[model samples]
Target: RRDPFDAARGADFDHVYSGVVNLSTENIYSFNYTSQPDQVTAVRVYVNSSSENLNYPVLVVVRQQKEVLSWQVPLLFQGLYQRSYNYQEVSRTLCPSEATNETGPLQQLIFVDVASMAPLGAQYKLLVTKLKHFQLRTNVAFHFTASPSQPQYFLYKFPKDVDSVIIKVVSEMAYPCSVVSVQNIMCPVYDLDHNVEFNGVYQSMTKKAAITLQKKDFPGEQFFVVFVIKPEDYACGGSFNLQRKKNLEVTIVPSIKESVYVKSSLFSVFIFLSFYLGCLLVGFVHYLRFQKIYFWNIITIAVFYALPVIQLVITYQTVVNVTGNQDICYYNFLCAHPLGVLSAFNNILSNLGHVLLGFLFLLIVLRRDILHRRALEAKDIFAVEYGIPKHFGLFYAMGIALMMEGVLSACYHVCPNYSNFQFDTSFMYMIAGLCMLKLYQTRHPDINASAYSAYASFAVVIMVTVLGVVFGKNDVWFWVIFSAIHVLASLALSTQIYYMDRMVLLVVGNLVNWSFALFGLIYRPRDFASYMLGIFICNLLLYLAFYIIMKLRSSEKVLPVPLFCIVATAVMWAAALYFFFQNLSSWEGTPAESREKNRECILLDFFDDHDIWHFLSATALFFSFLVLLTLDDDLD
Candidate 1:
């Protein structure tokens, strides 16, 4: 038997073999090459054109001797197909011979196979080359045309002195492309036809894509960037004349300095974390000094504070365990500053407002409770008989929930996606529910919703929200079920309030609820979470207005503090809602679509519009809680 390996031993390195080849279902073309030691080798194949007019699929396989290394099948539309291959070195040591006493350069056999199954035997020019060390120069715009089957590769060996590398790609056309980075000798592999997963620093790009990597991320000297135009079935609109080649320009620049945005983000995180720690200490001192304050308040504060610790642990774990930006969502990348592991560090840190105001509200509640207790002990008739009975349990819960809202929100922003969005909104739902319950309890203390019942209702609302997020986009059944629950729950709550002898208020509440429900059913908004939250806010406002009217109707007067709180709450809410409407990203769309909506930082060059929403909303909620607490103060 003839040895085929012997024929490739003297083949020239860094040479391109270009020729026309006839390929059919039964034909396979194979080539072999030897690699140089201490240098990376790349085998790039370009199937320039074919004899047939229709699109055809070609398979390229790379092998080391007899062992298979990697394979890809890219669809060729109008002769637009290209691919590349490379592998990791199996051994690094070059042993010296006993007689020669000199180390020999390490080398390996690389086999390439290209085959096509076009019905009418496609004829194409194949360019096969194995480059010894293909390195990218800094700030150079290397332009190339890529196709579904043909991906471009570039190498960058980072200098030991540099701290970071930034790779940016821009394209004139709005073609969907994927840019991937990997370390060491291995080239990035991906299967667009199947759901196979590969490890790489991946980012989806349309018009542009940019990724920054630290020296710590790639300990190896060799860094590879793979750019591939994603294959689509209808990419060429089933037309043979349409151009499938996508032109792209990419630049890789190494920097000796760190990012200023990253420095600012770290500074913000430090400031926010320190503020939360101080709040935690204040809560602790209050617990130790005022033992008469409800224990649940302290417990709630402790639990709320625990969330930040949990988030920090998670961030540390992610940094230590995960590689690249695979676990991080792309929407975070849209923001100006992205830290080492936490993509949206500023967004996470902006939650400090909630923690600060939540602890502030808790202190206020404790002070008010102490005053009421002192007044009652002194046998003050007004405090003993005229005021609504004070129950601080709900107030404590609201304060803690407010703080937890910040923590959970930070956690959600760590990696905001459709799957984990409920983490943030769940607390918001609970806060809204708790506020409504607190308002009702102010007047009907004996007939208020139990803790178990209220929490159970919250659980249901959260579950519904999750379902809506998953299936509410196009599923009719989800809307039907959601609307049914909404209408039934609204009527039940209305009936309960009506039995309290407010028939006119019940009519107004039911009308608003029914109108919102009808609108939801007819419009069927894709964003179910926001839609439901809108209804909650509407009902809350209506209930607050009704409470003030009933008090006035009974000849009761509004106290100055409560009146001030009402005005403050209204102003804060107005500002908060304005920011809320400025959508940063949408969970309902693809990650790329969501990223398209991402805007630069709007506050302090660190926080974005969403962060402003967090701050304003927290302040607004704190003022609203004050209104509930002080509304009946004049009765005393």
Candidate 2:
């Protein structure tokens, strides 16, 4: 607010202020002021424009009236412009209607308060609204959505007679929305009843708008609202899709309920606590027996402990960002619950397979060391004496790389943006692939002979990295390439190692690899009698592979994993599959889809698919580790 008392008498409202008003293609500028009721005043507007383009007309209107202040147009055209503010007395009586050159408004309110001073009597309040038109550089496509990514094409029904139905419309906030009907299903241009607007050039659909549908403004009668959005200001030919049946249907009651306050918990606690204890006990055993620090021993154990925490923190933050939308939450913290004590916990648990693989990595290289109860040849490089040589330096490096891989896994799980997640998983694939090759080199006695293996793995890693970069946004191709990479890693390992369960480990360990591969291929779960036989086949194959191997190779002396453990692992894998399918029953969609549907929907305040998968898989690793801890040298 500015005082007109002193300026009212001046030879000039003398330069009160000067600043450039930034304008855009479609924009509405408004200024409001009150009047003294009796006295009239004249004000001057001065400016220069940056654009001379004209499908580009500028509109200046006083008050919310049918008349637009015109004489200002001639001033605006010279690239230099000026206009006066007079006739503040009465807008309707004095300014009857707009000229052939002008436009805009509806019935508006005007109020005035009197000041005690007689000198202030001649002042008045006025509001200046301006609309600017111009051509936009790009075309915008509307994506009507219920939440963030959930699409609604035909009927997006809202619960009837409720408070407000909020929908997100991604666009330039500065653009105006209009309707073409009286029923308010389209036109009856209501009070811009919606809120928020902005202007800018976006490379992508990054801007978001949340529109509120008030039941009071929209009586349940027509039961819907339809509207068209136009590029703010345009003329002559006039273009718009101002009417249609994009149903904002209202219902008797909203389907969401409080009782379903979704959440997942206990599962995370079990996995984390057990994995931690397992590692802690491993470390304590070494300490009590050796009484000296073993670098590799401690590092592997430390990774096991720290890995879970990293995944949860990164994932938790991602959830916090995503949950900004009311309909979303953590894998367990759905909108109804809107909390995540268990959501992220389950996230960590679900991805711990990487951590478990790290443990496998530790045991594989340290097979001789742990069983012999000493460091690599007691820290001395030895000549060909056993199955594989310990490149102690490379071994430790591999361990560290695996931990870094765990970081990548966590990031992929929690990254707020999908593009970032793609790069993350890509690095994860490349690094894991490299590590497998490196593992082979570390295990092989002759480095020179292993060069081809190293070159091949590096080639695969680089290829995958390039694919990841090229098709970073193409989720399908990204995973399909990974499927191929997984096959490479597994096949590469099969030829070089002679572990009793090599085939089993190679096949079962890369299920995530196949998960992505199948993501590129398979869609969902269930079948005729076998039910979603595709999913069952994956589960069955895994179960059969692990079980059959153990059953056939029942008695091997060299680091042989116990048959009972294998059977137990196979059974658990089968159950996880069975239950995963059972869990699918709840969504009747793809596991990917189901997981998403329930990602934020809680099964309990502390448990969900994330935790369940964590436990099921972690249990497999837990049993595998038991066998790992007991295995000894080849000779009996």
Candidate 3:
């Protein structure tokens, strides 16, 4: 048999191919078997495309290891399609492109190397994957018709994917196969087959052709691969396939692992850190401007950070309330559900919904006296003498705190059940009483504590317990006197216990923190990267304009900001509550679908991973606080 392998490869390929595009810098090649009991046989090479059209030069140098033999780069096909001279290990990868008899006039490529010479069943590293484009949605089983005249059909089994399709077509074949790319299917390689036709015919298996979905895009799509094993005219006596249905889940997202998680967590920390750093700077500057109000301002910043963190804890655990109306129906609520009780948490804004609201009510009640004290040093921005007296503010803040504590205690007990309207009514009554108490304190600061007693709050607790009894249930807890806790933090908590001179060292610490962040951002492997330094450079220019605005932002310009902020807050909150909780009357409107799709949410977050960098950042702010407390610029 005259060797199909050509000579004069290098000279010919170099002249023609290099004229079009140079071959890769390194040598790349593979080897494959021709028939059953396939074994490492011969390696092929395309010396150069500069010469004749029949460019592939086959049957070259074989790497031999006693009983083993394979191909290497020294004698191999030009690695044009194989991605240049960096050929992968051969033994585990190289195989006959496909076994061929006469049905397939197609050819596939192969790389033979020292790796192929090692063992018969060695596993190769994963290289590529593909997805077909014609599936209506995600499905595992596929049925493809090779021809219409007869009924040459293939049925595949269910693939391993959730809400998706996966199909694998395993075949027995070898190298020198031609990899082709069809619109519906990504690239598939076909080679000679010497079986299954009659005496023989090379077969290309769908499983053999990896679908590299990363480089392709198909939206609202379906996929099918029609292999013309034998054109109708050429088939002497076999079923001819015209078309086939291939159901596949083609979107291949990279697998998540340690490297990816660390990268994502680090990126997330910065979003919080940027806000934290800004607040830290503003806090220090504001402290310098007012002396007596310093404590309240610090309380405000702490509330800003702590409140959001608490909310994040809630949001993170909330099942994607896609519809927002689904209820928890599972048997386990206390042990398994832990934190999520639904509707009630949302009702927190109504009564005890958010951490800040609870704290805010407390502040409103307590600050009458404290604000009076501050008023002596720094007059109210809104009025000179209208600020509450220092003594009255304490009682007011305390009453609000009691109401908040009582309502929260009631919330966990009575929410979600239809009878929850009782808890809801009582919670609102507490708010009304808190409001009336505000009026009473303003008109009469000398009113006794018994006059604005914790009676309404206690009633709310009693009603909450009664509702549980009416419904014949028990979800009670020991009382937590949070109002007293805050009283200590505000009036008497000593900072000398936690302060340290080393706090001043934070200036250098901030530099180190930012450096670590820069390294992670630049070098980390992150998918769907949102920000690039290119964007930062553009923002820098925008800030320059804002700098001019800051220079001219006088008291007149600043005065309207608070007014605008208050208006914006009211509008945003009303809009948010409507869209968030009003929709989703049923879970998918079907019981089975509801069971399959319903997501559960809770306020008590169980998956809160303690991100170390997040801790480092939050701790750094404490250091900043210690430094700020000692500054002489009085915020009055």
Please, what are the lDDT tens digits per residue for candidate 1 over residues 479-515?
Answer: 7676677777777778778773457656765686677
Candidate 1 minimal-lDDT segment of 10 residues: 88-97
Per-residue alpha-carbon lDDT of model 2 for 323-362, expressed as tens digits?
4331122232232222243323334435655565556556
Question: Per-residue CA lDDT of candidate 3, range 1-636, in tens?
Answer: 522133112221112122221222122233222232221122222221212212322112333222232333222222223431222222111112223355334333333221222221222221211123232233333343321111121112122332223222222321112111223322221221221222111122222322212112333232332232322211222122112232221222221234433554455446445644665586688789886332363345335534543454345325423222223321111112122334222223222222223343344335434655676667456442433333344333433443433343334332233223233223323333433444334334555555335454545544444543443222223111222332343223123212223432343334334543563455421211112212222222222222324334422233443334334433443444333332221211222112222222222221111112112312322222222121211222
Better of 2 and 3 by lDDT: 2
- TM for every model, in the order presented, reads 0.68, 0.39, 0.27
> What's model 3's lDDT at 353?
24
Native-to-model Cα distance after best TM-score fit, residue 118 in candidate 3, in Å: 70
TM-score, prediction 1: 0.68
* lDDT of the structure predicted as candidate 1: 0.62
- Which candidate order results from sorting by lDDT in descending order? 1, 2, 3
Quantify how close model 1 is to the true structure by its C-alpha RMSD in Å. 8.9
Q: Pairing residues by index, what is the TM-score of model 3?
A: 0.27
- Candidates ranked, most accurate by TM-score first: 1, 2, 3
